[PDB]
Each structure stands twice: as C-alpha cells, then as structure tokens.
Amino acid sequence: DVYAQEKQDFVQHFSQIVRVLTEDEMGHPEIGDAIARLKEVLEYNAIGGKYNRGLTVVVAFRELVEPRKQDADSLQRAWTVGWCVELLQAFFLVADDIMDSSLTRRGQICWYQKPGVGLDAINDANLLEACIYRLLKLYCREQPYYLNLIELFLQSSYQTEIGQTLDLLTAPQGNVDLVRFTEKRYKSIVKYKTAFYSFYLPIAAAMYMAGIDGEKEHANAKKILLEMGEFFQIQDDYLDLFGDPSVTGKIGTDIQDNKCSWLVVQCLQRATPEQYQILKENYGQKEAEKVARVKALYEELDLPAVFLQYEEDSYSHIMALIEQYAAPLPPAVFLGLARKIYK
Amino acid sequence: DVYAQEKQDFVQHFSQIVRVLTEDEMGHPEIGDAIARLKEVLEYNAIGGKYNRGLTVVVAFRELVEPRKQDADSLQRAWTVGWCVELLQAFFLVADDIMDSSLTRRGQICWYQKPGVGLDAINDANLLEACIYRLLKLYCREQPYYLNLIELFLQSSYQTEIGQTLDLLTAPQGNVDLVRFTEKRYKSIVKYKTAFYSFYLPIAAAMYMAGIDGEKEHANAKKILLEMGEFFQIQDDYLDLFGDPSVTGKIGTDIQDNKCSWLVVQCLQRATPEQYQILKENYGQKEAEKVARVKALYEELDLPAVFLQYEEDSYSHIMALIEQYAAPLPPAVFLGLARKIYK
Numbered sequence: 001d002v003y004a005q006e007k008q009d010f011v012q013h014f015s016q017i018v019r020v021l022t023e024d025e026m027g028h029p030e031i032g033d034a035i036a037r038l039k040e041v042l043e044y045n046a047i048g049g050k051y052n053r054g055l056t057v058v059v060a061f062r063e064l065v066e067p068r069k070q071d072a073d074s075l076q077r078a079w080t081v082g083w084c085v086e087l088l089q090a091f092f093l094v095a096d097d098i099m100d101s102s103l104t105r106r107g108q109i110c111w112y113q114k115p116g117v118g119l120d121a122i123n124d125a126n127l128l129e130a131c132i133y134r135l136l137k138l139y140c141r142e143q144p145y146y147l148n149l150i151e152l153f154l155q156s157s158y159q160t161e162i163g164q165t166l167d168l169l170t171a172p173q174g175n176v177d178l179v180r181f182t183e184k185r186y187k188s189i190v191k192y193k194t195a196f197y198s199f200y201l202p203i204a205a206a207m208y209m210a211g212i213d214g215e216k217e218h219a220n221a222k223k224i225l226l227e228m229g230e231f232f233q234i235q236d237d238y239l240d241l242f243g244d245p246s247v248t249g250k251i252g253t254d255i256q257d258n259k260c261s262w263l264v265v266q267c268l269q270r271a272t273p274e275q276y277q278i279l280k281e282n283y284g285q286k287e288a289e290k291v292a293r294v295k296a297l298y299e300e301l302d303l304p305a306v307f308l309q310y311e312e313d314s315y316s317h318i319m320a321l322i323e324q325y326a327a328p329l330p331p332a333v334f335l336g337l338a339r340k341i342y343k
Numbered sequence: 344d345v346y347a348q349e350k351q352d353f354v355q356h357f358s359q360i361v362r363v364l365t366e367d368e369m370g371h372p373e374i375g376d377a378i379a380r381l382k383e384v385l386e387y388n389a390i391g392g393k394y395n396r397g398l399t400v401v402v403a404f405r406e407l408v409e410p411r412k413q414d415a416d417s418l419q420r421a422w423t424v425g426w427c428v429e430l431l432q433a434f435f436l437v438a439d440d441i442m443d444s445s446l447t448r449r450g451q452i453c454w455y456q457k458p459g460v461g462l463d464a465i466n467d468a469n470l471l472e473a474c475i476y477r478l479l480k481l482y483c484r485e486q487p488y489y490l491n492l493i494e495l496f497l498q499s500s501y502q503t504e505i506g507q508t509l510d511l512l513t514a515p516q517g518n519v520d521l522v523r524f525t526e527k528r529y530k531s532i533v534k535y536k537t538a539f540y541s542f543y544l545p546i547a548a549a550m551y552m553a554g555i556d557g558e559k560e561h562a563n564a565k566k567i568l569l570e571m572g573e574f575f576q577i578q579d580d581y582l583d584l585f586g587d588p589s590v591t592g593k594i595g596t597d598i599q600d601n602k603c604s605w606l607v608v609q610c611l612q613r614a615t616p617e618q619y620q621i622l623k624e625n626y627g628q629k630e631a632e633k634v635a636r637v638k639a640l641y642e643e644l645d646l647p648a649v650f651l652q653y654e655e656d657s658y659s660h661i662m663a664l665i666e667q668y669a670a671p672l673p674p675a676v677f678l679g680l681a682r683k684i685y686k
C-alpha cells in the first residue's frame with residue numbers, strides 16, 4: 001500500500017508531536033504534573049491503532065501538492081495535520097468508550113476502565129481535543145489555509161457530535177423499541193457520526209493544504225467520501241458481533257447497548273413476526289444468553305452472507321462514484337483509501 | 344449595577360441564540376431529533392445562572408466601543424459573544440458536575456443525574472462547546488477580530504482543561520495525602536481552572552471586538568483579571584462548605600472529593616499535629632460524620648473569620664492593581680466586575 005510506504009515515518013513523528021505538546025512546561029513549570037498526565041493520555045490513546053485517517057492526510061498531500069512544493073517544513077505540517085486527525089479520533093473514542101460501556105479498545109482496557117482513571121477521562125478527552133488546535137497554531141498559523149483547517153476541524157467535530165446524539169437517542173438503555181431502527185434512520189446516524197470525520201475530514205485537510213478550497217471540489221469529494229464512510233460504519237457494525245477481537249482490538253457492545261446497528265436494521269427487514277418477538281425479547285439487555293439468542297437469529301437470517309454481498313455492491317458503487325466525481329483530483333487519492341477499507 | 348442595566352436584555356436574547364442554533368434543521372431535517380436534544384440541553388444548562396461572565400462581555404463592549412460604533416448589528420455580535428462565554432461555562436460545568444460527583448447545580452439536579460441522561464451528558468457537553476464556534480461563524484466571520492476570538496476561546500479552553508487536570512490530580516479518590524495541599528499548588532490550580540475563563544476571557548473578547556489587540560494591553564488586563572479570578576475561586580471554595588445552598592444553588596462536595604480547597608490549605612497552615620491527624624482521618628471520605636468533623640475543625644480554627652479578612656485584603660489588592668494597570672482602558676470596566684464579585 002501507499003499507506004505502508006508512509007506509515008513507519010508517520011508513526012515515527014508521534015514522538016515529536018508529544019515532545020512539542022509536552023514542552024508548554026518551560027515557562028510554566030507549575031503545570032508540570034498536568035503535562036505529565038497529558039503525555040500519559042496521548043501515549044495510551046493516540047497510539048496502537050492503524051493510523052489510516054492520519055495517514056490519509058499525508059498520502060493525499062503528497063498526491064495533491066506539487067513535488068517541488070513538498071519541502072521539509074511543508075511535509076512536517078502535513079504529518080502534523082494527520083496527527084491532528086488522529087487526536088480528533090482519540091478524543092472521540094475515549095468519550096465513546098465511556099458512553100458505550102465498552103471494555104477494550106486497540107487491544108487494551110479502555111482508558112476510563114483503568115484503575116485510577118475513571119470519569120477523569122472526560123477531561124482527558126477534552127485535552128486531546130485542545131491539542132488539535134495547539135498543533136494547528138504551532139505549525140500552520142502563518143499559512144493561507146490556517147482558518148480553513150481550524151473551521152474544518154470544528155465543523156467536523158460538530159457534525160460528529162450531532163451524529164453521536166442521534167446514535168445515543170436511537171439507543172436508550174433499558175428501552176427496547178425496534179420500530180425506530182429503520183434504514184433511513186441508520187443512514188442519517190452514520191453520515192453524521194462517522195462519514196464526516198473519518199473520510200471527508202482527512203482528504204479535505206489535504207485539499208486545503210494544497211490550496212484546493214473551492215466549494216464544488218469539496219462537494220464532489222464529499223460525494224465519494226460520505227458514501228465510503230457509510231460503508232465503513234456498516235463494516236464496523238458487522239465486526240462488532242462477527243469480528244475477531246484479537247484482530248479488531250475491541251469487544252462488541254451494540255446488542256447490549258440497544259444500538260441501531262446495521263445488523264439489527266437488516267434483521268428487521270427480514271424477520272418473520274416470530275423472529276421479531278425473539279429480537280424484541282432479547283435485544284438491548286446485558287444477559288449473555290439473550291445476546292447469544294440475537295446472534296443466533298442473525299446467523300439464521302444469513303446476515304454474514306448479506307454483509308458479504310453488501311460489501312461487493314458497495315465497493316462497486318464507490319468505484320462508480322470515483323469515476324463520476326474524482327476529477328480534477330488524481331483518482332489514486334480515493335482508490336488508495338478504497339483499497340485500505342475494502343481489504 | 345451596570346450588570347442589572349444590561350441583564351434583562353441579555354437574557355432576552357437567549358431565545359434568539361437557541362432559535363439560530365436549532366434551525367440547522369431546515370436543509371437537514373434528518374438531524375431533527377438531535378437538534379431537539381440540543382435545545383433541551385441548552386435550556387437546562389445555560390439558563391438559571393447569574394450570567395455575569397456573558398454580561399461582562401456586553402458591559403465591557405459598551406464601555407470600550409465608541410457609541411457611534413455601537414450599531415444594531417455590533418450590539419448583537421456583542422451579546423452573541425457573551426452567550427458564547429456562557430456556553431463555554433455550560434460545557435465545562437456539565438463535565439465538572441460528573442467528575443466531582445455533584446448533586447445539584449443552579450437549584451436543580453445536575454444534568455447527568457437526570458433520569459435518562461446519565462453519561463450521555465458527556466456528548467451533550469461537547470455539543471455545548473461546538474455551539475460556541477457555530478455562533479462565532481454565524482455572527483462574526485466577516486469581522487477583523489474573528490480569528491482573535493476563535494483563538495481566545497480555544498486557548499481559554501486549553502488553559503481551563505489544564506487547570507481541571509491539576510484539580511483532579513491533586514484530588515485522587517480514596518487517596519488522602521494532605522502533603523500536596525500547599526498554597527503554591529493552590530494558586531496554580533485556580534489560575535488555570537478558573538481565572539482565565541471566568542475573568543480574562545470575557546474582557547479579552549470585548550477588547551478584541553473593540554480592536555484592542557495589543558499584547559501589552561492584554562497583558563496588563565490579565566494582571567488584574569487573574570488576581571480577581573483567584574479571589575473568585577477562594578470564594579467558591581469557602582461557599583462550598585459555608586454557603587447557603589438556597590443562595591448558591593449547589594451542594595458542596597470538596598471535602599468528600601479530597602479537593603485542594605482554599606479551606607484545607609488554610610487548615611493545614613494553622614493546624615496543630617493533633618488537628619492534622621483529625622483532618623487526615625476524616626478528609627476525602629463519603630461519610631457524613633467525617634465531613635462534619637472536618638467542618639468542625641475549620642470552625643475551631645476560625646476559617647470563616649480568616650476568609651472574611653482575606654476578602655478585605657484581596658479587595659484592597661485588586662483595587663490597587665486597577666490603579667496600576669487599568670490605563671488606557673476605563674477603570675469602570677474592572678470596577679463593575681469588582682463590584683459584582685465582592686458583593
């Protein structure tokens with residue numbers, strides 16, 4: 001992949017990110033303990049993933065910016081902005097893990113589950129968020145795209161938070177109403193909670209850094225990226241139940257948490273009234289036997305096979321959107337991302 | 344007060360703030376339920392306070408901007424930016440109430456304690472934060488001070504979050520070490536957690552709106568405002584134990600929560616080794632009888648009288664700093680604020 005060609009170098013740069021964020025300390029040694037906590041938080045929560053969102057900024061930048069304009073400082077700004085995307089993810093995930101009552105993330109216990117962390121993780125997440133704007137000021141403040149990037153991160157955060165609200169509102173604890181789990185509702189939740197920040201944000205950041213600021217170009221980019229994001233969230237929902245946690249790094253909670261998962265939507269489209277009652281009886285509950293019954297029902301209704309077919313159809317659709325909407329950007333910008341997510 | 348002269352009108356404007364924030368809905372009716380939740384969150388959490396921070400932007404604006412430049416639109420931008428300060432407070436308090444295990448706020452149950460809210464309040468707080476940047480874009484994007492304000496809110500949030508980290512790190516649950524509760528540590532915690540966002544932020548916002556952007560003018564302003572903020576937090580700590588909750592609107596938790604309160608710092612400065620052991624035995628614990636013992640010890644050591652004296656000395660000090668540092672701004676800018684907090 002073009003992603004493996006940039007990864008080791010991207011990751012390498014995290015030590016610099018941490019160093020520049022945790023040297024607000026000469027000048028202000030009274031905040032030392034707080035900066036030590038920030039370092040711990042950064043190291044626990046922004047490292048251990050695949051780095052695909054941050055890497056996408058870097059790879060897109062190199063593909064959109066003329067090689068004679070890819071000087072040392074410009075490349076550094078590019079991987080800084082990719083790390084800002086990673087930090088945005090880190091902030092959101094820390095908070096999400098608490099609100100979803102999750103156990104593990106990236107092959108370790110969730111930050112909030114750590115003895116001695118707990119709900120202090122809320123402020124830790126806010127700090128991760130603040131680091132984004134700190135790095136943008138330190139590295140990009142004199143660039144013509146500075147305000148574009150600040151506003152792109154802010155707006156992406158707002159959209160994401162709106163999607164989180166829909167997610168949580170459609171999934172009330174102890175309150176099983178399957179009636180709300182429609183395809184239309186599903187598409188809206190995932191557009192807001194995932195598609196903007198996971199797909200549109202990183203490419204858009206690289207577009208703005210390359211001086212591509214036009215509303216038409218950004219709107220065309222979105223046509224591809226929001227669709228890619230929807231697929232990505234459907235995949236996430238499928239892996240929540242059917243994925244191997246040694247590979248995914250995380251234990252699923254969607255059934256217990258009463259979530260408007262792609263799986264439950266597809267279940268409802270297919271289920272006889274008898275299967276509907278089974279689903280109603282067992283969904284949204286902590287008991288392991290009830291979760292098992294839901295999984296059994298999904299397997300009975302061939303949902304893994306339905307997912308496999310959906311992934312093929314989706315891949316073909318996204319490739320079609322690249323043919324329609326890529327120009328004037330290099331198709332490789334989107335195809336690389338397609339390759340990474342449809343693996 | 345100059346604050347009462349602007350309050351009814353300031354509060355009046357909240358209906359407009361809510362209307363403009365909850366009409367992201369024509370165009371995007373798929374987010375309707377989320378926008379309904381945002382309205383609920385806004386109404387519960389940004390209304391019911393004294394509005395002093397938001398009001399300070401408005402009053403300072405009128406005192407710093409030439410009356411011929413105080414047109415309809417400019418006044419509207421001023422009360423919008425004051426509401427942004429209120430929203431910053433609202434975001435921070437929702438999160439703080441969870442992390443401090445608080446019960447009530449502004450004479451009602453804390454948002455997170457509401458049946459059916461719970462830890463979903465984390466995302467609600469993030470949404471309140473997003474509304475700040477939304478209102479600044481909608482109302483101030485074409486103004487020469489736009490980036491100044493965005494960066495002032497972002498930086499104030501970072502500082503505040505650093506202060507929150509110090510607060511929480513100095514107050515580990517179930518872990519009583521009084522050794523860390525020093526005056527030096529106290530001053531650092533409150534500078535970061537309170538002084539920036541409660542005092543410096545609102546005046547600074549009005550300064551930038553009035554085209555007063557000079558580093559020397561902002562640095563002089565800070566000399567007064569950070570000191571005022573320290574006093575304000577000492578007052579907050581005193582009222583945590585000795586205030587009337589029908590007046591304060593909130594039930595105190597500092598002793599239970601093992602906080603580096605001004606009260607405990609002053610206790611440690613004065614306490615015999617026998618009183619030190621009593622404090623060690625009873626601090627940072629949930630039992631009502633142990634909290635009562637700590638309060639008894641404080642009363643034994645005349646801490647209310649010590650606070651009364653401190654408030655006089657502090658008032659005199661801040662007035663001295665106004666004489667030194669107010670120019671070239673009208674002294675009324677600071678004196679009005681002094682009047683409100685030393686009441």
Ligand SMILES: O=P(O)(O)C(O)(Cc1cnc2ccccn12)P(=O)(O)O
Binds near residue numbers: 240
């Ligand atoms: O927990 P994961 O990794 O399975 C999850 O995929 C995480 C996720 C998706 N979108 C957002 C937005 C903000 C915070 C977290 N987000 P989900 O949406 O299923 O919680």
Ligand SMILES: O=P(O)(O)C(O)(Cc1cnc2ccccn12)P(=O)(O)O
Binds near residue numbers: 439440536537583
């Ligand atoms: O709960 P209160 O109102 O007594 C409290 O005064 C609230 C407070 C002060 N400073 C901050 C910063 C962020 C969030 C809340 N903050 P405290 O600092 O004592 O928690």
Ligand SMILES: [Mg+2]
Binds near residue numbers: 096097100102
């Ligand atoms: Mg989750």
Ligand SMILES: [Mg+2]
Binds near residue numbers: 096100167
């Ligand atoms: Mg979630």
Ligand SMILES: [Mg+2]
Binds near residue numbers: 236237240
């Ligand atoms: Mg998931």
Ligand SMILES: [Mg+2]
Binds near residue numbers: 252257
């Ligand atoms: Mg879940």
Ligand SMILES: [Mg+2]
Binds near residue numbers: 439440443445
């Ligand atoms: Mg508190």
Ligand SMILES: [Mg+2]
Binds near residue numbers: 439510
């Ligand atoms: Mg607190």
Ligand SMILES: [Mg+2]
Binds near residue numbers: 580
């Ligand atoms: Mg307090």
Ligand SMILES: [Mg+2]
Binds near residue numbers: 443596597600
């Ligand atoms: Mg407390």
